[PDB]
């Protein structure tokens, strides 16, 4: 990720490797993703692997693989919490813009 900050999600080689990932491998990847998202900091890496899987698999097949309902019920509300925190961050980026507009109001 530190590399690929510079619909491509990674190096395209790594992307294709994830798209050729297997079923038991997928369950393991979702499980360790679940942990990484449970922490409130590594959720960026958690989200990158989730979105890469989502963009490169068949959703019906994913759902029909067993256990994914357990791991998805584990995943979802932590991501909603992250979402509302990001909302607060944007709303404070606007105090930064206000300082701009008042400074040029003064000038």
């Amino acid at each position: 990720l530190g590399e690929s900050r510079s619909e491509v999600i990674f190096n395209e080689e790594l992307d294709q490797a994830i798209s050729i990932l297997n079923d038991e491998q997928l369950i393991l990847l979702m499980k360790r993703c679940r942990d990484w998202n449970t922490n409130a900091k590594t959720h960026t890496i958690a989200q990158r692997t989730i979105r890469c899987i989502l963009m490169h698999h068949n959703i019906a097949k994913l759902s029909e693989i067993p256990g994914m309902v357990k791991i998805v019920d584990a995943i979802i509300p932590y991501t909603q919490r992250h979402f509302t925190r990001v909302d607060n961050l944007v709303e404070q980026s606007y105090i930064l813009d206000y300082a701009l507009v008042e400074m040029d109001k003064l000038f």
Partner: peptide
Amino acid sequence: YNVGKAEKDGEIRLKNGVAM
């Protein structure tokens, strides 16, 4: 869900989500 203590035997799960 909190992160449970590790299921398998040769691996260690802490409570902040870094598995070893």
